[PDB]
CSV table of C-alpha atoms in Angstrom, one decimal:
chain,number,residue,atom,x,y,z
A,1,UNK,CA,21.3,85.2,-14.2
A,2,UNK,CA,20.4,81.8,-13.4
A,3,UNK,CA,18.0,80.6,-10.2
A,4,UNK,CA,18.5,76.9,-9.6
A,5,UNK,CA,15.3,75.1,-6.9
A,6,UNK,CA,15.3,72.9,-4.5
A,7,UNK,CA,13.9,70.6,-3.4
A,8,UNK,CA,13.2,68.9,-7.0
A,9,UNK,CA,10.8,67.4,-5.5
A,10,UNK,CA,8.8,67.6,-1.9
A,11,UNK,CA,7.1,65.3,0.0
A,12,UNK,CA,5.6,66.1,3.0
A,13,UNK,CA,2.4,65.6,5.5
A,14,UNK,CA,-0.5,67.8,5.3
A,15,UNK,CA,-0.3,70.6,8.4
A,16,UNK,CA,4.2,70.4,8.2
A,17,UNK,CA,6.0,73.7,8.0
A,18,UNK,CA,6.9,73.5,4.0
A,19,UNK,CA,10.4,75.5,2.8
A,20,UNK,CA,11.6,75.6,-0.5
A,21,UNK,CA,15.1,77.3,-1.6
A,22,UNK,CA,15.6,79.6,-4.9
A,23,UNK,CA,19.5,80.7,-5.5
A,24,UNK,CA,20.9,83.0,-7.8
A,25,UNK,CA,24.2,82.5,-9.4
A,26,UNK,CA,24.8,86.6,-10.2
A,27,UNK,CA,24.1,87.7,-6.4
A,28,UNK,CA,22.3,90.8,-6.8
A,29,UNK,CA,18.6,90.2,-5.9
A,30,UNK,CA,16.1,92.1,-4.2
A,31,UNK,CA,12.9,91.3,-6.3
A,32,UNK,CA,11.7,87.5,-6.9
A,33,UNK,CA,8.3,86.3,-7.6
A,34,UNK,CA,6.9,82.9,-6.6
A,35,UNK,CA,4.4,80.3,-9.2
A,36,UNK,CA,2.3,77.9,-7.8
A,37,UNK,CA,1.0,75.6,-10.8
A,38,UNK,CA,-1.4,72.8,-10.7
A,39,UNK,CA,-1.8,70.2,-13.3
A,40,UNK,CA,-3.7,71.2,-16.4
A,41,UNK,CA,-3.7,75.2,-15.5
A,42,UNK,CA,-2.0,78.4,-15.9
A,43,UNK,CA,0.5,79.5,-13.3
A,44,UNK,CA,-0.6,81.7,-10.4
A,45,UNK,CA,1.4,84.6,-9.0
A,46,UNK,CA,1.7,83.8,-4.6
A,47,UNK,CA,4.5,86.4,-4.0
A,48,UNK,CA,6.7,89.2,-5.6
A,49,UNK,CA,9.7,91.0,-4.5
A,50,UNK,CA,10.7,88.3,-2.0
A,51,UNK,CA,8.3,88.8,0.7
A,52,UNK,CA,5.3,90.4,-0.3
A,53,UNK,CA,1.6,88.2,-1.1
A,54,UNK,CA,-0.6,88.7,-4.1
A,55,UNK,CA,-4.1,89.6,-3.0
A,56,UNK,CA,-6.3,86.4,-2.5
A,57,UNK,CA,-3.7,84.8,-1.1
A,58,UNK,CA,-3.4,82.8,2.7
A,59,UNK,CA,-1.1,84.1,5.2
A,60,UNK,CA,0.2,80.6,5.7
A,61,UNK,CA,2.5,81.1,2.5
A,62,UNK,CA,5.5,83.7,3.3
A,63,UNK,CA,8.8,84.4,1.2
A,64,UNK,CA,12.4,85.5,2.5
A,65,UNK,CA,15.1,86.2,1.8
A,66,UNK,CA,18.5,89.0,0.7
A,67,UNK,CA,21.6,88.4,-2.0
A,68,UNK,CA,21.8,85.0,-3.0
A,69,UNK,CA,19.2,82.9,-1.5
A,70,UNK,CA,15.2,83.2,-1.3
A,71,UNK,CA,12.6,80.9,0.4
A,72,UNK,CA,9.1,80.2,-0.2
A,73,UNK,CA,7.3,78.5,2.7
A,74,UNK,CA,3.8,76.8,3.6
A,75,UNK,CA,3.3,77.6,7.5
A,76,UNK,CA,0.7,74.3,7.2
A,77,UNK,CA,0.4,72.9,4.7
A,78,UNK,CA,-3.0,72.6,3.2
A,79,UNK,CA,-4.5,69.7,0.7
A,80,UNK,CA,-5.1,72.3,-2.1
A,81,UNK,CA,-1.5,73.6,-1.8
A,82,UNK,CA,-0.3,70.2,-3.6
A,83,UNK,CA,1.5,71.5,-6.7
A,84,UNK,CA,4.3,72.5,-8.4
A,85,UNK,CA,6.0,75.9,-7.0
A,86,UNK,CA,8.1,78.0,-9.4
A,87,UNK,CA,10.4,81.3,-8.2
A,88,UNK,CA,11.5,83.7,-10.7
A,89,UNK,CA,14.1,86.2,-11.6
A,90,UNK,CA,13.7,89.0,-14.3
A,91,UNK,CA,13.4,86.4,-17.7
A,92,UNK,CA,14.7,84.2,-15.9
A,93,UNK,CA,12.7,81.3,-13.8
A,94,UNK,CA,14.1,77.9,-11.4
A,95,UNK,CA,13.4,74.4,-12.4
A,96,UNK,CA,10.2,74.3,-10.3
A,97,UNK,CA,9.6,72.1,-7.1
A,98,UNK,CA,6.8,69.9,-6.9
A,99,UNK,CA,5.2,69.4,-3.6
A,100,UNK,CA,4.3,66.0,-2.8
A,101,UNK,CA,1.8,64.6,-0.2
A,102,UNK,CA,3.7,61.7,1.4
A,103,UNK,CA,3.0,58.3,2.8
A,104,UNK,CA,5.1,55.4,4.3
A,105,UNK,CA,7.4,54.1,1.7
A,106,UNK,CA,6.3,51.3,-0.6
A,107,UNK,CA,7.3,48.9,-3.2
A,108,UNK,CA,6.9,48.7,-6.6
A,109,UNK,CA,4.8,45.4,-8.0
A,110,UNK,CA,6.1,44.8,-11.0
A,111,UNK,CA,4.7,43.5,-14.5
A,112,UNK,CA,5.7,42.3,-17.3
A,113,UNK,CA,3.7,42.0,-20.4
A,114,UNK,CA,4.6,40.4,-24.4
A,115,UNK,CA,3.3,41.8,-27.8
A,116,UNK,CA,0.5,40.6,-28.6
A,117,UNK,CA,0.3,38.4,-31.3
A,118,UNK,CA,-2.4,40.8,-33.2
A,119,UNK,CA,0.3,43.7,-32.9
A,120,UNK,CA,2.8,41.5,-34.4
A,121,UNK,CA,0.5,41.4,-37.3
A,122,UNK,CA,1.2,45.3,-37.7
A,123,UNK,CA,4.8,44.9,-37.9
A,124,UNK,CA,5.9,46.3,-34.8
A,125,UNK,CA,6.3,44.8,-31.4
A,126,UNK,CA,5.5,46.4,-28.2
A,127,UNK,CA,6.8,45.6,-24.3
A,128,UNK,CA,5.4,46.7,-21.7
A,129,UNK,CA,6.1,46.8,-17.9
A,130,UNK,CA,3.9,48.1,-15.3
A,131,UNK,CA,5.1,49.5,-11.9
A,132,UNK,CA,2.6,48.9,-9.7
A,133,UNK,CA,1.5,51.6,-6.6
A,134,UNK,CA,4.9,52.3,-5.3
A,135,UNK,CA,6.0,55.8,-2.9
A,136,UNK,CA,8.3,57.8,-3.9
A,137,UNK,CA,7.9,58.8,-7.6
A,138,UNK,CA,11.2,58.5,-8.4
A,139,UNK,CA,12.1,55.2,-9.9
A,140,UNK,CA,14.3,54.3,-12.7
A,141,UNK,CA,13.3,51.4,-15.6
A,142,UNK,CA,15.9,49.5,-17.7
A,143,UNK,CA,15.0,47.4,-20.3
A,144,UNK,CA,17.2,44.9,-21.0
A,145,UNK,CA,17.0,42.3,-24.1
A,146,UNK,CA,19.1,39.1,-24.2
A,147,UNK,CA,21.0,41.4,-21.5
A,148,UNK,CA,21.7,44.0,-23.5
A,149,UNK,CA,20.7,47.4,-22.6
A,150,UNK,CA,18.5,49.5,-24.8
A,151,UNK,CA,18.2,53.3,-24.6
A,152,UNK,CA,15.9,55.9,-26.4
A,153,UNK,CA,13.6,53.1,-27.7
A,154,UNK,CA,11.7,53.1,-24.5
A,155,UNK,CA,8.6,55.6,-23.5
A,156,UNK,CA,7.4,56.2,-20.4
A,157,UNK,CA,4.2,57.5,-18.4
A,158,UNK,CA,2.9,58.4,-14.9
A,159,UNK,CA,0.3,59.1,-13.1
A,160,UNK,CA,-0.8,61.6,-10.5
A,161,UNK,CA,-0.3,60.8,-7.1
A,162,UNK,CA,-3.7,58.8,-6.3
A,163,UNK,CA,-6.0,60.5,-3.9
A,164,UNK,CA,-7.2,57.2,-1.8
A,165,UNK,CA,-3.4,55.6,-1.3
A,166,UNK,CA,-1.2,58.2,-2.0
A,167,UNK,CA,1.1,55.8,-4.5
A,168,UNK,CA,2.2,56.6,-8.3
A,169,UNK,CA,2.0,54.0,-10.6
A,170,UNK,CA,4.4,53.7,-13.6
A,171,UNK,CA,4.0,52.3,-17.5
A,172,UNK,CA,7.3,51.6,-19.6
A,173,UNK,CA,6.8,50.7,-23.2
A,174,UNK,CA,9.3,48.9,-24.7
A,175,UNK,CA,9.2,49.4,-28.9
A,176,UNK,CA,10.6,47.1,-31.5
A,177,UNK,CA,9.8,45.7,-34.8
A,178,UNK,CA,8.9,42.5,-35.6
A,179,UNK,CA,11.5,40.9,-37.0
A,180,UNK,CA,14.1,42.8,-34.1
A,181,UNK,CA,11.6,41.0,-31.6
A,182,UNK,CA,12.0,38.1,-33.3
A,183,UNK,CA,15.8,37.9,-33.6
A,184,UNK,CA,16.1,38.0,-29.4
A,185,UNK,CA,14.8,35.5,-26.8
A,186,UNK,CA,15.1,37.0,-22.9
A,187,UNK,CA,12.7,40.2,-22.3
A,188,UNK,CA,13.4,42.1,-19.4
A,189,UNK,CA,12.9,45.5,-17.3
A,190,UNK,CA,15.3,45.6,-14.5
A,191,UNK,CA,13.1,48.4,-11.8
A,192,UNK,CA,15.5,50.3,-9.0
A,193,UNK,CA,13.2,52.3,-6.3
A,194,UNK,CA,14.4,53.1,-2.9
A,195,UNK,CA,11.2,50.6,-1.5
A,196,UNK,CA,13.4,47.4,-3.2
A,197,UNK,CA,16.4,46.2,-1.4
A,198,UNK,CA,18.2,45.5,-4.8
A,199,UNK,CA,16.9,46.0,-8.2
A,200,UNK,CA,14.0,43.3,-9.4
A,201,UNK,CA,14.0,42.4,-12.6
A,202,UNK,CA,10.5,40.8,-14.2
A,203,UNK,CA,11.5,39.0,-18.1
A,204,UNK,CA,9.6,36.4,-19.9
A,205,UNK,CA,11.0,34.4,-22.7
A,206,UNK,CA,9.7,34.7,-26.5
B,1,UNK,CA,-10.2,91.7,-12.5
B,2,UNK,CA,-7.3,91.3,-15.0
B,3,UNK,CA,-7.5,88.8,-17.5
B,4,UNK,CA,-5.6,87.3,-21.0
B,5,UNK,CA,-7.5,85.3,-23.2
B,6,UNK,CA,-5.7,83.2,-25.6
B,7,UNK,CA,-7.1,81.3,-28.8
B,8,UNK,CA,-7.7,77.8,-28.7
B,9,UNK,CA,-5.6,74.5,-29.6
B,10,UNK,CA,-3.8,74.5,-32.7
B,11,UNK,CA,-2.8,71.5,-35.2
B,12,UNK,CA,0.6,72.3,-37.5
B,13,UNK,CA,2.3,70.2,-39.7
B,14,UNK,CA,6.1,70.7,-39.3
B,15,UNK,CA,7.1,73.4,-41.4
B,16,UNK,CA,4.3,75.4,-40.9
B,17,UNK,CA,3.1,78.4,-38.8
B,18,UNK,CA,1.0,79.2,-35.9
B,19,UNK,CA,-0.2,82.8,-34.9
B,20,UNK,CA,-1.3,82.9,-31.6
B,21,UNK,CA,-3.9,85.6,-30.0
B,22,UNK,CA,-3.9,87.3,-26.4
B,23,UNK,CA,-7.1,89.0,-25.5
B,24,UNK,CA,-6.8,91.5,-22.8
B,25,UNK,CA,-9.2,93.2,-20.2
B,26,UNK,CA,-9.6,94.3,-16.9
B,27,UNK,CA,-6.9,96.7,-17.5
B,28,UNK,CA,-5.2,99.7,-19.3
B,29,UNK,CA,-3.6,97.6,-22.3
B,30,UNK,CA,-1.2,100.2,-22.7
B,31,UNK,CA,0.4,100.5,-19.7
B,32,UNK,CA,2.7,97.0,-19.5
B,33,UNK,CA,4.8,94.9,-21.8
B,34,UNK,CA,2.8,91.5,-23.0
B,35,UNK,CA,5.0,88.6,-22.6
B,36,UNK,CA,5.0,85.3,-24.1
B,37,UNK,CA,6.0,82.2,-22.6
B,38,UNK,CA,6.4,78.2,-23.4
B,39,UNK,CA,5.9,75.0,-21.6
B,40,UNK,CA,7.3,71.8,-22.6
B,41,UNK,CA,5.0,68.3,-21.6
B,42,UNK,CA,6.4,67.7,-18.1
B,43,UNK,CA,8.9,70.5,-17.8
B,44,UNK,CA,9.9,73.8,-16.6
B,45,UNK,CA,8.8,77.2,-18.3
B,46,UNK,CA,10.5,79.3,-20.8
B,47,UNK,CA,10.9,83.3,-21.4
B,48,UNK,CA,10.3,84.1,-25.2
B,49,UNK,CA,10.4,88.0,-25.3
B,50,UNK,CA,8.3,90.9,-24.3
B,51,UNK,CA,6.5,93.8,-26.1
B,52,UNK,CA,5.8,96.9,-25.9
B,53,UNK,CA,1.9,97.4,-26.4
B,54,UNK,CA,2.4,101.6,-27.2
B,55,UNK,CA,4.5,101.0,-29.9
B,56,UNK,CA,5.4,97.4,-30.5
B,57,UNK,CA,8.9,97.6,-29.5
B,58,UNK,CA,10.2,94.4,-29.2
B,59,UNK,CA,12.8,92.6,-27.0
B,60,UNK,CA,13.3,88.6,-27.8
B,61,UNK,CA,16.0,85.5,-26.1
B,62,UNK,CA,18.8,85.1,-28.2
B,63,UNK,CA,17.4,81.3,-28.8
B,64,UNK,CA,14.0,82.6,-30.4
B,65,UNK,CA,15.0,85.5,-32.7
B,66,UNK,CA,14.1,85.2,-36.3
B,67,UNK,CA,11.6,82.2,-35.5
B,68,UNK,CA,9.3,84.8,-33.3
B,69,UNK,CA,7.5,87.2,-33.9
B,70,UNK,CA,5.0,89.8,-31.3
B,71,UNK,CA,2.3,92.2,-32.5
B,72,UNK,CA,-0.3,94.0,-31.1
B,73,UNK,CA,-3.9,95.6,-32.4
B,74,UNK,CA,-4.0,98.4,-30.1
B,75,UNK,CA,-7.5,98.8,-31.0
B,76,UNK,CA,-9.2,95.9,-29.5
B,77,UNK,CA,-6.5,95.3,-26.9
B,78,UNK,CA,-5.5,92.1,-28.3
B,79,UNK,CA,-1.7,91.1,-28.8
B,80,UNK,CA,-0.4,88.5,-31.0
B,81,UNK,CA,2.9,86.4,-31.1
B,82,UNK,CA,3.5,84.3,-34.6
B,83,UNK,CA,6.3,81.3,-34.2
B,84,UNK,CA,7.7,80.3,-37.3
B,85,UNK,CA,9.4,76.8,-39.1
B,86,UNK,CA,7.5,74.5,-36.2
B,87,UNK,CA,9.8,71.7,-35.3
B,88,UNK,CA,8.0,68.5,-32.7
B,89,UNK,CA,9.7,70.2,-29.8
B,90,UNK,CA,7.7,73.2,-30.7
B,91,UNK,CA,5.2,70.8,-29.2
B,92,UNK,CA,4.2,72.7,-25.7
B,93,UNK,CA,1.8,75.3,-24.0
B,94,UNK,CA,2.4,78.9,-24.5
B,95,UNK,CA,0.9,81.6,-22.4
B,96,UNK,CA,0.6,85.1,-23.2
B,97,UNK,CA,1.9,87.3,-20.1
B,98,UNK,CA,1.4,90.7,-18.7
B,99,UNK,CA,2.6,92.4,-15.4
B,100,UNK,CA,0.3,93.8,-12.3
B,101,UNK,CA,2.7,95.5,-10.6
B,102,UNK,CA,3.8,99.6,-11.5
B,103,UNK,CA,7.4,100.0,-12.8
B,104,UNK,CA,7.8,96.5,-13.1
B,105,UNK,CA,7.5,94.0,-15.8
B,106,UNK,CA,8.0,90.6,-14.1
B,107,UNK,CA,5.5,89.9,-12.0
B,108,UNK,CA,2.7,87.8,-13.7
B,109,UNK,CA,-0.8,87.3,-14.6
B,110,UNK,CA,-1.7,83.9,-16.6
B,111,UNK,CA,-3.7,83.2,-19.8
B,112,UNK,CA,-5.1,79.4,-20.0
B,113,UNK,CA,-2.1,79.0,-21.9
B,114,UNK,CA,-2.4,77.6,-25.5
B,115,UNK,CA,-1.5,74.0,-26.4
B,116,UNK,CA,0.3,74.1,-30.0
B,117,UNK,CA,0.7,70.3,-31.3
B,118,UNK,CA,3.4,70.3,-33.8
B,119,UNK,CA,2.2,67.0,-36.0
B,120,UNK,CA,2.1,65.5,-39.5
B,121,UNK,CA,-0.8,63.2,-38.1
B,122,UNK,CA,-3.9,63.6,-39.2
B,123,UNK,CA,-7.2,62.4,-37.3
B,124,UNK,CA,-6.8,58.8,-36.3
B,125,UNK,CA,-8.8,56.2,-34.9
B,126,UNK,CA,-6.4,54.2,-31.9
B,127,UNK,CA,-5.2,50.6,-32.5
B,128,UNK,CA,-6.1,48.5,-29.2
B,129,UNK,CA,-4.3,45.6,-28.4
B,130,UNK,CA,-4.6,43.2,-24.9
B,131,UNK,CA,-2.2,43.0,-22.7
B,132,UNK,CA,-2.8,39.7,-21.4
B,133,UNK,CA,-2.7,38.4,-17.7
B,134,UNK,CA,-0.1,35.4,-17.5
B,135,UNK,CA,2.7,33.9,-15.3
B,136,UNK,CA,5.0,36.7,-15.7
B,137,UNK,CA,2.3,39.6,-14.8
B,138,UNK,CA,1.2,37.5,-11.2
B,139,UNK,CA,2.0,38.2,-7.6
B,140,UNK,CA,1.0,37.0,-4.7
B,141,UNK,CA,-2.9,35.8,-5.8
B,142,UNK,CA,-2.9,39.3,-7.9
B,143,UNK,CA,-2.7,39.7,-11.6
B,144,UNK,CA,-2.6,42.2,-13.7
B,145,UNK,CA,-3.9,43.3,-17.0
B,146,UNK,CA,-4.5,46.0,-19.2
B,147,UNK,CA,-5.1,47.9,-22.5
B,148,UNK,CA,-2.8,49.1,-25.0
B,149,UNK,CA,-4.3,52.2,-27.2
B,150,UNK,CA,-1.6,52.9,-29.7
B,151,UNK,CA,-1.5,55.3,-32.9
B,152,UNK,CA,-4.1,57.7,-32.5
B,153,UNK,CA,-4.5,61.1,-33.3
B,154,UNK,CA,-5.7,63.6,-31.6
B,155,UNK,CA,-6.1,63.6,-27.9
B,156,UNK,CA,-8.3,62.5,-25.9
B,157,UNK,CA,-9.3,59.1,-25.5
B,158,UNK,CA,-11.5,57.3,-22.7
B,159,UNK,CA,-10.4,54.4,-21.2
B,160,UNK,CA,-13.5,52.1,-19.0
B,161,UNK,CA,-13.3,48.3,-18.1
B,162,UNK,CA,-16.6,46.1,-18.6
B,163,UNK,CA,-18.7,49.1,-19.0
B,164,UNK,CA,-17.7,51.1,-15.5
B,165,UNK,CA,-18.1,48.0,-13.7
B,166,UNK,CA,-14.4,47.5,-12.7
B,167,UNK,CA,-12.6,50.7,-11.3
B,168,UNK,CA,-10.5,49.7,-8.5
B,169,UNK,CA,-7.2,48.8,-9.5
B,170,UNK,CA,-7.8,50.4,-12.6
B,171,UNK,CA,-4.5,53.0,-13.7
B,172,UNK,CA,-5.2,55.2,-17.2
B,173,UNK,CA,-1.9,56.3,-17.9
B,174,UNK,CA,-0.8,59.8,-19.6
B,175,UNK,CA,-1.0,60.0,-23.6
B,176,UNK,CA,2.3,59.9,-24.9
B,177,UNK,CA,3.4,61.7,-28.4
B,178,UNK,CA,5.4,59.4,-30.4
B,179,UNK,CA,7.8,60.4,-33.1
B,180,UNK,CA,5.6,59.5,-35.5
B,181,UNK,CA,3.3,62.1,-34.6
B,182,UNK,CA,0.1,59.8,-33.1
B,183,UNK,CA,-0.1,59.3,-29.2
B,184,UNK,CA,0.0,56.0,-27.7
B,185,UNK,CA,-1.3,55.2,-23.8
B,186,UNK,CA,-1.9,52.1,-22.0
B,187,UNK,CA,-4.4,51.0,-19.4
B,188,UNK,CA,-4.1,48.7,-16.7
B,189,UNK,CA,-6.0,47.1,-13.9
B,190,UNK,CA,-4.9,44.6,-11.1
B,191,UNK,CA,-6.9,42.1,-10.2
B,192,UNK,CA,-7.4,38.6,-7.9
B,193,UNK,CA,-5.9,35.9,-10.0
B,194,UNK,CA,-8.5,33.7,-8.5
B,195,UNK,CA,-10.7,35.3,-10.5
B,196,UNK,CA,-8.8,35.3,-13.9
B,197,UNK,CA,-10.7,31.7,-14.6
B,198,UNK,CA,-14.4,33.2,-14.1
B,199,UNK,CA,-14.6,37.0,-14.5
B,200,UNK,CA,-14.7,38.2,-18.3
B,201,UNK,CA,-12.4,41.6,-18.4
B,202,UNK,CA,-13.5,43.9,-21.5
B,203,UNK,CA,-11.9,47.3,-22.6
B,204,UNK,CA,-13.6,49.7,-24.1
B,205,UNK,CA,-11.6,52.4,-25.7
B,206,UNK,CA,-13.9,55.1,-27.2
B,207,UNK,CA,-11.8,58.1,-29.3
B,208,UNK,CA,-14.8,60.6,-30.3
B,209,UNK,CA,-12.5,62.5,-33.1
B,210,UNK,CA,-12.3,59.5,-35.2
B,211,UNK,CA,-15.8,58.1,-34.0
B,212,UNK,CA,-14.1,55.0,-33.4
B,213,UNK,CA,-15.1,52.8,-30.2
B,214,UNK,CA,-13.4,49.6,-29.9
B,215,UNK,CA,-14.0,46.7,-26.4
B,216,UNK,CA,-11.9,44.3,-26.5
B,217,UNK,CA,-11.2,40.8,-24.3
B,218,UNK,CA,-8.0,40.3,-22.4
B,219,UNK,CA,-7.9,36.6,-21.8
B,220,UNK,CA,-5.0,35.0,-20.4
């Protein structure tokens, strides 16, 4: 069997009704247990066979659900309920939904930033561009070199959702060799978030 | 109150193998299966087989058998799962698993969960290089700047700017493992640009399993 989550991802305002949605492909279901996870710890168990709460637990989180489709809801939600949420199905568990606090949407500021010349020293160059406090999470980086695209020689990394502003900020590093950086002339990460109109692209040239 | 206690972080060099412990108490040890189960870095969790703690019978994913292995000393309630030929994407955290409720197996109770770092690295001290303010990293009357701590091996290192005096602004970013094996982060701050002509901006990347400390100055 297979359970498949949504939302992938969650964002909503602290005391908002909260549903997430579980579905299995085989159809027969009457027992599903629900994770919450927070980051940096073990799993913990918030409801088995559909509807029923581990001990501990509020009463603002419920389950539902028959057949095909099972729900785990936050009646309001709560600052310490930001997390990821996993259901489950015999060996089988969904892709997990991580619940978001939101704020009003916001642009990425976007940086660019050259190898230094000590690195070059090393024999291997490094890009980097910086996505600056920006809402949603999800935002895609390109990197682009004399405007040609470059795939799986990029890395990148984010951070939690910050406590005071409620942005993410995002790090892209761009990794080449010394003599490949030196062979090229335009450097350039092209960013796409819902906050920008069209695509910005920050570059520098060697 | 139930509780799994698993051994701490392991190092392996691909090729090798880990063995990894499950301490168990609050409960009859006997009674339900032990189940063992993986994490990737920033990703979903994964089933690798359950066992029998009566008699060590053994039921395993079709992806995992002959690379896994579960046993079990009875006598001290402790349970043990031994993975096999470690690749990098062995890389993860594994947690050993048991289930509170009668006549079912699924429902479960965490251990901390046990990183495994699959690497040929050995301990390294990080190489830190600026990443200097200039035209290209300004807007509006902001700049930015930051740190780049590259090659290092193991986790953790701590990122501060001039000494604690500068936190706002200031984003640490998530170690990444690289393919060589040693982690690589960066660490940035934003600041006024009015101020990049005055205000001196040190780093000062300290990595206490290699000893090694290093500030350095980002100038323009």
């Amino acid at each position: 069997i297979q359970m498949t989550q949504s939302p992938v991802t969650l964002s909503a305002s602290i005391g908002d009704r909260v549903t997430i949605t579980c579905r299995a492909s085989q159809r027969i279901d009457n027992w599903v247990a629900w994770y919450q996870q927070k980051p940096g710890r073990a799993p913990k168990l918030l409801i088995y066979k559909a509807s029923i709460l581990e001990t501990g637990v509020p009463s603002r989180f419920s389950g539902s659900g028959s057949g095909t489709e099972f729900t785990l809801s936050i009646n309001s939600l709560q600052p310490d309920d930001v997390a990821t949420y996993y259901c489950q199905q015999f060996e089988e568990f969904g892709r997990g939904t991580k619940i978001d606090i939101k704020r009003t949407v916001a642009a990425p500021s976007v940086f660019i930033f050259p190898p230094s010349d000590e690195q070059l020293k090393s024999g291997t160059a490094s890009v980097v561009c910086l996505l600056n406090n920006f809402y949603p999470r999800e935002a895609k980086v390109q990197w682009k070199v004399d405007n040609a695209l470059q795939s799986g020689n990029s890395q990148e990394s984010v951070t939690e959702q910050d406590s005071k502003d409620s942005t993410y900020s995002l790090s892209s590093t761009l990794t080449l060799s010394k003599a490949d950086y030196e062979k090229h002339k335009v450097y350039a990460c092209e960013v796409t978030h819902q906050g920008l109109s069209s695509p910005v692209t920050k570059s520098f040239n060697r | 109150q139930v509780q799994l206690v698993e051994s701490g972080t392991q190092f392996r060099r691909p090729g090798a193998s880990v063995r990894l412990s499950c301490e168990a108490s609050g409960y009859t040890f006997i009674s339900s299966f032990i189940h063992w189960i993986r994490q990737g870095p920033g990703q979903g969790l994964e089933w690798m087989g359950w066992m029998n703690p009566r008699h060590g019978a053994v039921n395993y994913p079709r992806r995992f058998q002959g690379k896994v292995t579960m046993t079990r000393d009875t006598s001290i309630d402790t349970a043990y799962m031994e993975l096999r030929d470690l690749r990098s994407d062995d890389t993860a955290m594994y947690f050993c698993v048991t289930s509170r409720t009668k006549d079912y197996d699924w429902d479960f109770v965490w251990g901390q969960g046990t990183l495994v770092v699959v690497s040929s690295a050995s301990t390294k001290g990080p190489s830190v290089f600026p990443l200097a303010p200039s035209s290209k990293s300004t807007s509006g009357g902001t700049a930015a700047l930051g740190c780049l701590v590259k090659d290092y091996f193991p986790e953790p290192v701590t990122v501060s700017w001039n000494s604690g005096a500068l936190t706002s602004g200031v984003h640490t970013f998530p170690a990444v493992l690289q393919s060589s094996g040693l982690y690589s982060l960066s660490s940035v701050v934003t600041v006024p640009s009015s101020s990049l002509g005055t205000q001196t901006y040190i780093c000062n990347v300290n990595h206490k399993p290699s000893n090694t400390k290093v500030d350095k100055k980002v100038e323009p």
